[PDB]
Amino acid sequence: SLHPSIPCPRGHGAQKAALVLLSACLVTLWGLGEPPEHTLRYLVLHLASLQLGLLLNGVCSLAEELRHIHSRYRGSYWRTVRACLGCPLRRGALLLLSIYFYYSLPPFTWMLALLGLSQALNILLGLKGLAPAEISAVCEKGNFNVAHGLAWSYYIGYLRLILPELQARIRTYNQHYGAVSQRLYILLPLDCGVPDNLSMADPNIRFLDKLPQQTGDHAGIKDRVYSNSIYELLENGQRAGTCVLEYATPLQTLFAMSQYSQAGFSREDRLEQAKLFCRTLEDILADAPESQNNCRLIAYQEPFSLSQEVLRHL
Amino acid sequence: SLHPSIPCPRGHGAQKAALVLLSACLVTLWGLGEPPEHTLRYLVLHLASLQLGLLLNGVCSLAEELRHIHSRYRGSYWRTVRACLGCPLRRGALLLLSIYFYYSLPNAVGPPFTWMLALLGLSQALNILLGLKGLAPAEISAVCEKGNFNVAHGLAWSYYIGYLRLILPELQARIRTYNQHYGAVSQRLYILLPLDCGVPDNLSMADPNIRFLDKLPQQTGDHAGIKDRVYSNSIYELLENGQRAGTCVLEYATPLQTLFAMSQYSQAGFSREDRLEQAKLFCRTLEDILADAPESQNNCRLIAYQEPFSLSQEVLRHL
Amino acid sequence: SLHPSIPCPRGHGAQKAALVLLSACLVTLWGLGEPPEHTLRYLVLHLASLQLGLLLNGVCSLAEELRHIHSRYRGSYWRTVRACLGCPLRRGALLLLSIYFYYSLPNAVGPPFTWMLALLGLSQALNILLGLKGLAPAEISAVCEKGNFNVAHGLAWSYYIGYLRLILPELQARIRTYNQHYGAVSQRLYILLPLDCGVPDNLSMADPNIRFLDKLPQQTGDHAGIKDRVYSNSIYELLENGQRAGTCVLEYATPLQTLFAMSQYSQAGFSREDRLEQAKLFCRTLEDILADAPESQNNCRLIAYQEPFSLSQEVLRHL
Amino acid sequence: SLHPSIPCPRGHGAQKAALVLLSACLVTLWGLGEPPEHTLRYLVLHLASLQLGLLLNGVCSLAEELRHIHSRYRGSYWRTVRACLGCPLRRGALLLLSIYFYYSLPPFTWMLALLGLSQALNILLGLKGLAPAEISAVCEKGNFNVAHGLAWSYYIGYLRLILPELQARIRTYNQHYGAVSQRLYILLPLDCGVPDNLSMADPNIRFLDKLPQQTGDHAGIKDRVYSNSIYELLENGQRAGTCVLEYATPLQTLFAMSQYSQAGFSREDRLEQAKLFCRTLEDILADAPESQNNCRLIAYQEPFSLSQEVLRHL
Ligand SMILES: CC1(C)C(=O)N(Cc2c(F)cccc2Cl)c2cc(C(=O)NCc3c(F)cc(F)cc3F)ccc21
Ligand SMILES: CC1(C)C(=O)N(Cc2c(F)cccc2Cl)c2cc(C(=O)NCc3c(F)cc(F)cc3F)ccc21
Ligand SMILES: O=C(Nc1cc(F)c(F)cc1C(=O)O)c1ccc(-n2ccnc2)nn1
Ligand SMILES: O=C(Nc1cc(F)c(F)cc1C(=O)O)c1ccc(-n2ccnc2)nn1
Ligand SMILES: O=C(Nc1cc(F)c(F)cc1C(=O)O)c1ccc(-n2ccnc2)nn1
Ligand SMILES: O=C(Nc1cc(F)c(F)cc1C(=O)O)c1ccc(-n2ccnc2)nn1
């Protein structure tokens, strides 16, 4: 519910489609009025072909990966073989079953050579690639996303370091001094726009003062200084509200990555990873122990006044 | 060059192995003496069956990608179909070839076209439902490396852009000002890259031979909506047998500490093996960036090390 | 959307036409009713012959690319072979398939393997020597657009990086300083893009209704080894029936003037048709850059026009 | 002679290889001792098939380009057809000749349909692409290079306006002021690494003075000013030469383009276009009327002191 454009996690629509396809194929096989022992024989033979093709692809991948045995696989052949062929025991059982089914069910070495040729063509010309939807699904399942690491690092390195101390500093500033809200408002620009000043993003927002700076050592730096800025959110020139505004710096860096050529990062990838960053940041703040209603994410996309949105969240 | 354990980028060993396999298969087909027409016919029929299976798998995936059309594909069906089934025109041409060459060509090993379609749909549905069509870790790693689908890629580019790209231009001026106003501190930034991702908050606890000495002048600058953000780096000293061997500006790579924390947290879905791989990828990507970046022109150095030891000796060796 | 005559980027009409042609050819092959095995056999034989012709052409090209190995290919033969013949592994696999599927398969229309190779080498040599295997200007334009092999692409990116990326950040401050200390000058730099590339040195001669009014404060900055390079922009006023209708920071795009000069010079190898194509492409590329660039945010406006007229009326209309 | 790594223009090595291949093919046809009427028939049929395939490819390209008729082809169908099919008259003559030879020489519509299918596959899957060497040769022949336009624009827009009066400015400065050279030394770093100051590139080069600025209108800007800088060249810490040093700004922008992701410009392309820029700029200055031994290009590659190179060129 952060923003309507944020993608929801993938469910089981592909599984439902596969179930429907399985049902339809069973219905049409029954309706063909043709003996089912041949059906089972063909199905077993086809799965055997798929298993042997996977074996050959994994053997080629193993030939590639045996150079990285000391680097990625800590100098062990077993981990390399597991990486390139899945579980060795189950894969071996399936390959022996497939070999037996070919050598038993009614040539074989000719089919084996031709299947090896097909697998070689698949590897060399890239026939069996990966569609963008498949890559996205695999990355989201295995958390192989730039945004996942970026948002978890934003939470661990910054947010959990300040949030309770930030509430304490807000209380101290209020009692010393138009009270400021006791929460850090972090803006998430989905599409674009991450100026170094809130005034540049919107002149209606004006820097008011600075919170009592927090100085604590963090990752090899003695007395690291945190300086959070209070902003007045005005409305027709009057102080409608005031609170601690901030921008999610990993979003700025996602934009910068999309700018650089060496990053291998595209505008579509930039927007997608910004959406995932916001999604997983909200997801981990929901279950965070530090987040105790002392942090508010304001996700927005420019089609617009930021100050009105911040007041709406206030 | 940072560390021997950091893996080199993937080469073309798989393609060379595939070429050798193709040559062996061609030699075997020539030796067996089977008619070449049958060999070509069955090869084309196999490729057609694979293409039709890809069609069915793409349709099944489109069944679940169609409800993310507004959120992920800007509400356009063409982008969804392109993401699921690939390029619509090339995929359509390939499926037209597959249909024509299976409906027409004879097939002794394989059922007629309607029976083939039923059986291939059955097998593809089984593969999708049971998860039989899966990717081994090596293929997933290769795809992620080619497509930059790593947490380490983003983390290293973020360490560059968000932190290094800000202090590196002014670090030389700050060190010169410190030297003039007040041994001599080195002019290079020494980023420590522990491959074990053990990053103490206080660097003194890492090794007693490094003790905090002083602080560089604070660099005040606006950044991402924080007015007057303060960068207060630190100047440390290195002790050899208790004597002041050298001084430097030492710190750790914060993304490595966040990687370790992710490996600690359960919700992160991050494992120790994944932690080590992404630490090495972060180090490699940062090294490549600094090699290509114009800001780091003899201005920053990276200390990559693995605990099997004293950090002070390694830093002095790099001095 | 600058001008109607500026061409849109090339779409996929060729691929759609190819798909329609493929469908028609498949329908025709079904209609005649020749054995499908013969169809597949002859298609594979034709593709094999094409691949072997590509091999021969690549070898002939490698004969001339081998003497630029040190200058162009850093002295390594692998880059030369990759440039000439493509990817060595994929090309080798395709060549092995072609050789096997021609020497093995029967062929009623076509010679035996050695006779085919001799005749195909003869034909490829004839194509290379007589220049028969040439590219029509449409394919050359498509390849140049896809690969950014245009003078206009580099010229537009150079106008952005070398000039606009330097004055646009401080243009607002300069105009504000001028306004405070002195009608009111507009806050946007108006870059005129004449598609005829007629760029007068003195903009007054283009149309008398535009007249120079004053000069913005000089921007002094280092750039490309020129110490204290001075950008002295000028402001113009726009007249309507002799009255001061408006005032703005108006200037021309110098790369268009250089394009016109290239069309004038004989050694440039630049024609009037090429001049017009590259002018329109420069306008399109600059528009795309300014749309994507962060420097241009309500700071610069492009006035693209073609003489069939008064420039002042167009600039006022855009005002 | 500007730099050893500068590529020389492509010669006729491909033509010589084609001639050798033609000779070897003639020898082997004579060697097989097999009748030449069948040889001529096969050759004519092969060229006819190639011509028909080119016709089909051009028809597909015409279907693509017919929507750019008003933009690129001035709203005339004849220009679009010429662009997509070459010369209409010669192409038509060749197609009628090929059709007649294909039909007359001992099916036809079946072969035509199969050739159309092959051409459709070539277009859709991109079998008949363009190798990097072929693209480079075509671009060099047709001057479709970024560097060509960049260097011609550098000559016309900058050098053509300062070179005539640079000698007068230098003479005036020398009279008012230990003699500075009467040539503009332009540095051409093949790595496109240009600092904004010569001191940053090499601290042994120090800024000496400023030439009397040249003020003249240029391309819609009244009284555009040029401020050339005289630098100091030092050897062993003492003055050894004084000259007007400058960097080729198109090389700066080539580097910047290689940096930006939107440019579609790579590092290999950056180096190649830097080399072509230097080559064609040296070619332009060889016949430029303005260049009267009042301009010297300096090309170098960092494996080295720039000041020593400038002294060597002095
Ligand atoms: C390369 C070679 C000789 C080969 O090794 N196989 C594996 C294989 C089978 F797939 C099927 C039976 C035996 C073998 Cl032994 C193959 C298959 C075809 C073919 O027509 N497959 C259609 C097809 C099916 F037959 C069953 C099915 F469930 C789905 C399906 F889509 C053509 C050439 C080959
Ligand atoms: C698609 C289809 C049916 C077709 O339309 N042609 C055109 C054509 C010729 F190219 C050659 C002769 C007749 C026809 Cl009619 C074709 C050719 C082959 C083939 O085997 N070409 C080898 C080959 C040669 F025969 C002569 C040569 F100088 C070089 C060469 F490389 C296979 C299938 C076809
Ligand atoms: O790593 C840092 N920052 C970031 C890293 C990211 F990966 C990112 F995506 C965003 C940032 C960011 O903060 O902008 C960082 C490190 C040290 C200090 N520092 C040194 C002295 N005092 C403070 N400040 N920042
Ligand atoms: O994003 C930040 N940090 C990091 C983000 C990462 F993704 C990471 F991997 C490491 C860090 C890190 O520096 O520890 C960050 C943001 C704002 C401020 N801040 C606001 C006012 N004063 C200081 N400080 N740090
Ligand atoms: O177009 C310009 N420059 C360039 C264009 C390129 F395509 C390139 F490759 C490099 C340059 C460059 O000079 O750096 C340009 C235009 C106007 C003024 N100017 C405005 C007021 N006074 C002077 N100055 N420069
Ligand atoms: O490169 C320059 N100009 C251009 C280059 C182009 F490629 C182009 F298409 C247009 C121009 C142009 O501005 O006319 C240039 C370089 C140095 C100085 N300069 C040196 C001292 N003071 C001023 N002025 N101009």
Question: Any idea what the CATH number is for the domain that residue A154 is in?
Answer: 3.40.50.12100
Closest CB to A260 among D261, D265, D266: D261
- CA–centroid distance, residue A251 to ligand 4 (Å): 12
Q: CA of A15: which chain B residue's CA is closest?
A: B129
For ligand 6, what atom is nearest to the CA of residue D219? 14
Is D300's C-beta closer than 6 angstroms to any atom of ligand 6?
no
Q: Which of A4, A302, A267 is nearest to B71 (CA)?
A: A4
- Closest C-alpha residue for ligand 3 atom 25: B163
A59 is in an annotated binding site: no
Is C254's C-beta closer than 6 angstroms to any atom of ligand 5?
yes
Determined by cryo-EM
CA–CA separation, B221 vs B260, rounded Å?
Answer: 29
- Whether residue C204 contacts residue C311, with contact meaning beta carbons closer than 8 Å, is answered with no
Query: Cβ of B17 and A60 within 8 Å?
Result: yes
> Is position A25 within any domain?
no
CA–CA separation, C158 vs C168, rounded Å?
Answer: 14
Structure token digits, residue B156 = 């290293």
D190 and D243 assigned to the same domain: yes
Protein residues whose CB sits closer than 6 Å to any atom of ligand 3: A 153, 221, 224, 249-250, 253; B 155, 158-159, 162-163, 231-233, 254-255
For ligand 5, what atom is nearest to the CA of residue C162? 14
Burial class (CB in 10 A: 0-12, 13-18, 19+), A214: middle
> Is position D299 within any domain?
yes
Domain final residue pick, D129, D155, D171:
D129
- CA–centroid distance, residue A114 to ligand 2 (Å): 26
Q: Which of B161, B153, B152, B138 is nearest to B262 (CA)?
A: B152
Domain final residue pick, B108, B134, B160:
B134
D175 and D302 assigned to the same domain: yes
Q: Which of A209, A137, A145 is nearest to A174 (CA)?
A: A209
- CA–centroid distance, residue D248 to ligand 6 (Å): 9
Could you list the beta-strand ranges (E) of A36-176.
none
Q: Which chain B positions have a beta carbon within 8 Å of C19's beta carbon?
A: 89, 92-93
Is D286's C-beta closer than 6 angstroms to any atom of ligand 5?
no
For ligand 6, what atom is nearest to the CA of residue D249? 1
How far is the alpha carbon of D61 from chain A, nearest alpha carbon, in Å? 26
D227 is in an annotated binding site: yes
- Whether residue C42 contacts residue B103, with contact meaning beta carbons closer than 8 Å, is answered with no
D210 and D298 assigned to the same domain: yes
> Is position A8 within any domain?
no
Is D218's C-beta closer than 6 angstroms to any atom of ligand 5?
no
The DSSP call for residue B189 is E
> Is position C61 within any domain?
yes
Q: CA of D124: which chain B residue's CA is closest?
A: B90
**Per-residue CA distances from A201 to A49, A204, A257, A313, D87 (Å):** 59, 9, 20, 17, 57
- Closest C-alpha residue for ligand 4 atom 2: A158
Torsion sign, CA atoms C174, C2, C283, A200: positive
Closest CB to B41 among C16, C26, C40: C40
Closest CB to A259 among D261, D265, D266: D261
Is C162's C-beta closer than 6 angstroms to any atom of ligand 5?
yes
B181 and B309 assigned to the same domain: yes
Closest CB to C225 among D50, D67, D198: D198
- Whether residue A37 contacts residue B91, with contact meaning beta carbons closer than 8 Å, is answered with no
C110 and C48 assigned to the same domain: yes
- CA–centroid distance, residue A50 to ligand 2 (Å): 36
CB within 8 Å of A9: residues ≥ 6 apart? A140
Q: Which chain B positions have a beta carbon within 8 Å of C22's beta carbon?
A: 93, 96-97
- Dihedral class, residue A86 (left if φ above 0, else alpha if ψ from -120 to 50, else beta): left
- CA–centroid distance, residue B228 to ligand 3 (Å): 14
Number of Cβ within a 10 Å radius of residue D236:
6
Residue C213's Cα: distance from chain center in Å? Answer: 37
CA–CA separation, C66 vs C60, rounded Å?
Answer: 10
Q: How many residues are recorded in chain D?
A: 314
- Whether residue D26 contacts residue C112, with contact meaning beta carbons closer than 8 Å, is answered with no
Q: CA of A34: which chain B residue's CA is closest?
A: B115
What are residue C91's phi and psi, to 5 degrees?
A: -65, -40
Chains touching chain B, criterion 3+ CB pairs below 8 Å: A, C, D
Could you give the angle at which helices B77-85 and A132-142 cross, rounded to 10 degrees?
80
CB within 8 Å of D243: residues ≥ 6 apart? D180, D181, D183, D185, D230, D231, D233, D310, D314
CA–CA separation, D112 vs D114, rounded Å?
Answer: 5
- Whether residue A219 contacts residue B201, with contact meaning beta carbons closer than 8 Å, is answered with yes
Burial class (CB in 10 A: 0-12, 13-18, 19+), A222: buried
C-to-N gaps above 2.5 Å in chain C, after residues: 182, 308
Count of domains forming chain C? 2
Is C158's C-beta closer than 6 angstroms to any atom of ligand 5?
yes
Closest CB to D249 among C15, C162, C222: C162
CA–CA separation, D279 vs C74, rounded Å?
Answer: 17
Query: Cβ of D29 and C71 within 8 Å?
Result: no
Q: How would DSSP label each residue in chain D? A: ---TTSPPPP-SHHHHHHHHHHHHHHHHHHHHT--HHHHHHHHHHHHHHHHHHHHHHHHHHHHHHGGGTTTTSTT-HHHHHHHHHSSHHHHHHHHHHHHHHHHH----HHHHHHHHHHHHHHHHHTSS---HHHHHHHHHHHT--HHHHHHHHHIIIIIHHHHHHHHHHHHHHHHH-----SSEEEEEETT----SSHHHH-TTEEEEEE---EEE--SS-TTEEE--EEEEEEETTEEEEEEEEEE-HHHHHHHHHHHBTTTT--HHHHHHHHHHHHHHHHHHHHH-SS-SS-EEEEEE-----HHHHHHHH-
A84 and A202 assigned to the same domain: no
> Is position C85 within any domain?
yes
Query: Cβ of B90 and D120 within 8 Å?
Result: no
A162 and A289 assigned to the same domain: yes
> Is position C166 within any domain?
yes
Structure token digits, residue C311 = 């420039």
- Whether residue B129 contacts residue A22, with contact meaning beta carbons closer than 8 Å, is answered with yes
Mutate to test the pocket of ligand 4, among B199, B257, B258 (most ligand atoms within 8 A of CB): B258
Q: How would DSSP label each residue in B48-102? A: HHHHHHHHHHHHHHHHHHGGGHHHHSTT-HHHHHHHHHS-HHHHHHHHHHHHHHH
- Closest C-alpha residue for ligand 6 atom 23: D226
Chains touching chain C, criterion 3+ CB pairs below 8 Å: A, B, D
**Alpha-helix runs per DSSP H in C66-112:** 69-72, 77-85, 88-103
**Per-residue CA distances from D290 to C258, D161, D162, D285 (Å):** 16, 9, 9, 8
Range of the domain at D111: 35-129
A152 and A300 assigned to the same domain: yes
Q: Which residue has the tokens 């060190």?
A: B175
Q: Which chain A positions have a beta carbon within 8 Å of B127's beta carbon?
A: 50
Q: CA of B103: which chain C residue's CA is closest?
A: C36
Instruction: Count Cα neighbours of D297 within 13 Å in the Cβ-side half-sphere.
Output: 24
Q: Which residue has the tokens 């939107």?
A: D262
How far is the alpha carbon of D57 from chain B, nearest alpha carbon, in Å? 16
Domain final residue pick, B103, B134, B165:
B134
CA–CA separation, D277 vs D249, rounded Å?
Answer: 11
- Whether residue B277 contacts residue A72, with contact meaning beta carbons closer than 8 Å, is answered with yes
- Closest C-alpha residue for ligand 4 atom 9: B255
Beta bridge partners of B193: B304
D150 and D123 assigned to the same domain: no
> Is position B79 within any domain?
yes
What are residue C235's phi and psi, to 5 degrees?
A: -110, 145
Q: CA of C250: which chain D residue's CA is closest?
A: D220
D188 and D307 assigned to the same domain: yes
To which H or E segment does residue C213 belong? strand C210-215
C63 and C88 assigned to the same domain: yes
C253 and C306 assigned to the same domain: yes
| Resolution of the experimentally solved model in angstroms | 3.1
Q: Which chain C positions have a beta carbon within 8 Å of D24's beta carbon?
A: 121
> Is position B118 within any domain?
yes
How far is the alpha carbon of B289 from chain A, nearest alpha carbon, in Å? 8
Query: Cβ of C139 and D61 within 8 Å?
Result: yes
- Whether residue B286 contacts residue B253, with contact meaning beta carbons closer than 8 Å, is answered with yes
Q: CA of A220: which chain B residue's CA is closest?
A: B203
